[PDB]
Design a protein around this nucleic acid. Structure first.
Lengths: 51, 55, 167, 117
RNA sequence: GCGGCCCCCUGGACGAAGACUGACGCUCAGGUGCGAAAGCGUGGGGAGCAAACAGGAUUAGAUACCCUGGUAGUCCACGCCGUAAACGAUGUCGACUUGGAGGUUGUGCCCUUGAGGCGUGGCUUCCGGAGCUAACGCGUUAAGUCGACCGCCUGGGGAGUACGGCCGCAAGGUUAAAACUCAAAUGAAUUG
């Protein structure tokens, strides 16, 4: 995740690595633990976005 | 194919971090990526490519 | 006042161990604080001379914060208490309410009571005053009256009791 | 003083925290600042304007040395993380690195559960 | 119910041709074993957070919804416990009956000549013919037409309790209780 960022850009341009790290999942597990539920929530975008 | 000694060729299928690229992007057959992932993990054990690129 | 915000010509500076340093230039104190690698806090700017206390920044910060915080928790533990009373009282739920009320009062919390009168009591205020007296009658040595009701505000009553303090 | 052109800027943007700390290789104290120390008690400490004011606060606390560039230890997806760097990178100096050092633990520990809201 | 990489045993599954046994098959009352997590017994550990518990804020509040600590506990060793929305809310086995779009797995050939057709199995989703249903829907893996054999249902509450028995010291688990009460509890579908 170590990159040699320079002056002009000043913002972001690390979307791929930020998505790879994905602190959201650790933030969510920080509060409550489930082990089961996300399986039901998925398989809906692919099923719906077809025509 | 069944080989594992093409780390240069293998490097194309890893991220800059070396992370495991799903076939959704590459489009390879599942059988192939299975052996590819095995080879990648074994190479990681041999420290040819790191666990992650920040090491 | 921090750094250059200090404007008093003469200030009272005291050492870390409490020695009397007298009135000295602010430059030396600022240099000592900067070498002390932490931030600078002034306590009383309005005093002439302003009083300055030097101690390592958040060590002293959160020590005094601890003192104030424990003094805040010195106040009685606050839940909120309110149980209504109705003249249309039955046999045992009367005792249920009485036990709840005495349980909350023994907790040593502030008083908060609302009492609803059943319907047409505005022309029959006699029953209301009698049941209030019976509350006093059932709390002769158990509760103390602070104000005596004479006026009816809508269908409820505004009245505040006081806690029994051992004096 | 004693320009070396390499150092460390530890920054950690949390929900109620955002800080900047400046040090060289060894780690004798050089500079740091806290948003909570800047005020903003309550839900204001990590807010972007408080974030950036603490950022130029730390920057000013460390402008005395005049070295050219350092590394930035980017940490914490808490509120801010951009107004902080935006106030920092605007210092005019060169920047060397942006690194999200926040580790990726892999089944590390069970975290708390109580909070309903 | 099962996911990093190594080393020992391995019911399966299908494709190929061949081979020899010659009905040797299905359900299986009781009977036998396995069996989510929690929990209970003797040995080590607590990074983990949380049962109780400790400090705070809180409205009509009832230890409450959030904060900081926190014991068992979860992990290996042996035993017990055998229940769960243990549901695809569909007992097991075999035979027949429109069509399409999938992935996934394999052999055969011919252009593998790239990423074509062929016959493959097992599942997968979307469909939807007929038909079946009160409808919802189901719909070659039928809730379609049949066959063979077990299990189970007979208004609601009373009530999975009364007792007895059985098994487990332990928590409890299976078999099943009337008197009384009701005229109903229902299931699918139309307007705010």
């Amino acid at each position: 995740i170590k990159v040699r960022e320079n002056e002009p850009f000043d913002v972001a341009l690390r979307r791929f690595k930020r998505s790879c790290e994905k602190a959201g999942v650790l933030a969510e597990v920080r509060r409550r633990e489930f082990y089961e539920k996300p399986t039901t929530e998925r398989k809906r975008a692919k099923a719906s976005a077809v025509k | 194919e069944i080989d594992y000694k093409d780390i240069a060729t293998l490097k194309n299928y890893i991220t800059e971090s070396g992370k495991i690229v799903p076939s959704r992007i590459t489009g390879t057959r599942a059988k192939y990526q299975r052996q590819l992932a095995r080879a990648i993990k074994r190479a990681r054990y041999l420290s040819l490519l790191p666990y992650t690129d920040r090491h | 006042r921090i750094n250059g915000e200090i404007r008093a010509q003469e200030v009272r500076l005291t050492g870390l161990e409490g020695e009397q340093l007298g009135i000295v230039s602010l430059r030396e104190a600022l240099e000592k604080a900067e070498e002390a690698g932490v931030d600078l806090v002034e306590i009383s700017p309005n005093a002439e001379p302003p009083v300055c206390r030097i101690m390592d920044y958040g060590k002293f910060l959160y020590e005094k914060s601890k003192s104030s915080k424990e003094q805040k928790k010195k106040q009685k533990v606050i839940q909120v208490k309110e149980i209504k009373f109705r003249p249309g009282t039955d046999e045992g739920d009367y005792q249920v309410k009485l036990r709840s009320l005495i349980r909350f009062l023994e907790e040593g919390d502030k008083a908060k009571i609302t009492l609803r009168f059943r319907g047409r009591e505005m022309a029959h205020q006699q029953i209301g005053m009698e049941v209030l007296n019976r509350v006093k009658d059932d709390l002769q040595e158990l509760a103390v009256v602070e104000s005596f009701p004479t006026k009816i505000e809508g269908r409820q009553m505004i009245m505040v009791l006081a806690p029994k303090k051992k004096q | 003083r004693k320009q070396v052109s390499d150092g460390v800027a530890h920054i950690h943007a949390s929900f109620n925290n955002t800080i900047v700390t400046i040090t060289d290789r060894q780690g004798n104290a050089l500079g740091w600042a806290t948003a909570g120390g800047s005020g903003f008690r309550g839900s204001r400490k990590s807010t972007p304007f408080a974030a950036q004011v603490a950022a130029e606060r730390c920057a000013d606390a460390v402008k005395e040395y005049g070295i050219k560039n350092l590394e930035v230890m980017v940490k914490g997806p808490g509120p801010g993380r951009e107004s902080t760097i935006r106030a920092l990178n605007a210092a005019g100096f060169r920047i060397t690195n942006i690194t999200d050092v926040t580790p990726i633990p892999h089944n590390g520990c069970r975290p708390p559960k109580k909070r309903r809201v």
